[PDB]
Design a protein around this ligand. Structure first.
Ligand SMILES: CNC(=O)CN1Cc2ccc(Cl)cc2[C@@]2(CCN(c3cncc4ccccc34)C2=O)C1
Ligand SMILES: CNC(=O)CN1Cc2ccc(Cl)cc2[C@@]2(CCN(c3cncc4ccccc34)C2=O)C1
Ligand SMILES: [Cl-]
Lengths: 305, 298
């Protein structure tokens, strides 16, 4: 019993974190085999950030301009190239602690663990979700750039995020491990703002099924709804549209609890209208949206209480 | 910016987790040097009588896909110590420490000697932890990291009827009035960790959330009279001293922040949130707030 925001064990990722320095800029890199991956803005000064020409800044660099530190050992850079917004530094030593890994691009609503690092040293691990507006509500200070997001389903680490910047509202933006940003963001200091954020509806439903599994049904009602009527109501509360894909994905949780997805949608409609009236669901007074259907199945018991 | 429930990086602890099997019971063990530590319930129980009937080969210890050979066994309080023939090459610098209620720690949840997740939690005033544990999680450990040293503070033993969890320090002494056996046991009435709520109010102010601040102050006695009525733990002079650095960083005296907490208790949040929460959060200590808002690494 119990329901916690759980992160993946970070050990496989800790063994990959290095410090990358180029001139006066210092950030984190990910050392996998003989390549160190890091944000390309490591080659920029604060002035360069307004309108950086990365190709022009990079062509003036040689291998020995990049200082890579793994623990207390200096790695030798023997090559460098740019792939989108990530810089790839070829080093002379392959990481002996390289885990089995993949680079995956995630969609909004997906969750992942973040290993927050400073100077190539890990400081903490937390769980978060890719918001519908492609930002993440992380906890990052200056020097955290290059920290990574990942999932570890089975013995394989799936790297999905690399931290690049903080937006004016305090939220964060970054890239997949191929250097493509999530969202309409650029690694440039321009007028950039997070779009209006919405609640991840399929995740709230999954978390309501998790409350039922752990023994709580106070929020259920005798009503059902059509998919269209639920979406008309949900969009009035800044909730993301629920698609047929989402309904299909919730099938296993619907079968385990005996509550149809459109019947759980009717409870959600009523919770949005009424609030909670001094009650909580899984120790929370707000509707939680950073647990996917897959996360609920992984954490919760197979036997409903 | 941002404020998250952050756990310590679990890597140093992952390299210590093993699977321990005795007959039909399977749980997790902590392999440090040549000793594996695990709950003694792996064996109305008379533990000395159950233990005397077991030989070394009755305990099956698995580290990854390698079988460790048990060469000795002894009991220390509610913890079984299995001497193995191989020292853990991944043993970190470590200490066994007993924590006090209100203190937080990271939990590496394991099943069959394999870590599945990591989360942060606090030792409640009633000595229980609101964890996330299923059958097979026994022997999962709680810890903190201070520089390069792992301080092991908790080993999971059982779940109470309300869904909360109970366990021991690494010397086998339970936290709380709990016993390792099937009998009528219940978590006591819980209280809110006041010094932790204040620390989290300071973290919100650091992150630019100040709507709850006011021009008022309070005495320590008047604040405690109010707090005792909302099932909040008493705030001591030690707690005020401990909040000093956060008070100096934000420019808000501790008794000034206490007056904001008093108004939040007597009047609610009125449709507003603090750090994305509609409840007053008490599982971040003053040190946790300082560490997360300063970037301390391990
Ligand atoms: C908040 N941003 C700024 O003051 C200027 N920043 C422009 C800028 C523009 C584009 C890119 Cl791709 C990077 C960047 C910087 C690089 C570092 N950085 C940061 C990242 N994470 C968390 C932070 C927390 C506090 C202060 C800075 C943080 C940025 O956003 C710098
Ligand atoms: C809920 N407990 C029971 O039904 C019986 N339990 C008696 C019992 C008596 C004494 C001791 Cl020291 C342990 C125990 C058990 C051993 C395992 N265990 C559990 C631990 N964590 C999480 C669990 C989640 C679900 C079911 C069991 C869990 C217990 O409390 C089992
Ligand atoms: Cl995805």
């Amino acid at each position: 019993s119990g329901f916690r925001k759980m992160a993946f064990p970070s050990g496989k990722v800790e063994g990959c974190m290095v410090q990358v320095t180029c001139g006066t800029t210092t950030l984190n890199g990910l050392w996998l085999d003989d390549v160190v991956y890091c944000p390309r803005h490591v080659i920029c000064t604060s002035e360069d950030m307004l309108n950086p020409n990365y190709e022009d800044l990079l062509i003036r660099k040689s291998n020995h301009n990049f200082l890579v530190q793994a623990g207390n050992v200096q790695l030798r850079v023997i090559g460098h190239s740019m792939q989108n917004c990530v810089l790839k530094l070829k080093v002379d030593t392959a990481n002996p602690k390289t885990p089995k890994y993949k680079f995956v691009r995630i969609q909004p609503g997906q969750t992942f663990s973040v290993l927050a690092c400073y100077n190539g040293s890990p400081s903490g691990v937390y769980q978060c979700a890719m918001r519908p507006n492609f930002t993440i509500k992380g906890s990052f200070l200056n020097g955290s750039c290059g920290s990574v997001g990942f999932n570890i389903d089975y013995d394989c680490v799936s790297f999905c995020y690399m931290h690049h910047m903080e937006l004016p509202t305090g939220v964060h933006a970054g890239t997949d491990l191929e250097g493509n940003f999530y969202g309409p963001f650029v690694d440039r200091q321009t007028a950039q703002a997070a779009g209006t954020d919405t609640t991840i509806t399929v995740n709230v439903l999954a978390w309501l099924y998790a409350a039922v599994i752990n023994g709580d049904r106070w929020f259920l009602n005798r009503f059902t709804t059509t998919l269209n009527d639920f979406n008309l109501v949900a969009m009035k509360y800044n909730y993301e549209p629920l698609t047929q894909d989402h309904v299909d994905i919730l099938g296993p949780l619907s079968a385990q609890t005996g509550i149809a997805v459109l019947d759980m949608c009717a409870s959600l409609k009523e919770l949005l209208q009424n609030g909670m009236n001094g009650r909580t669901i899984l120790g929370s007074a707000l509707l939680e949206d950073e647990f996917t259907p897959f996360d609920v199945v992984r954490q919760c018991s197979g036997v409903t209480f």
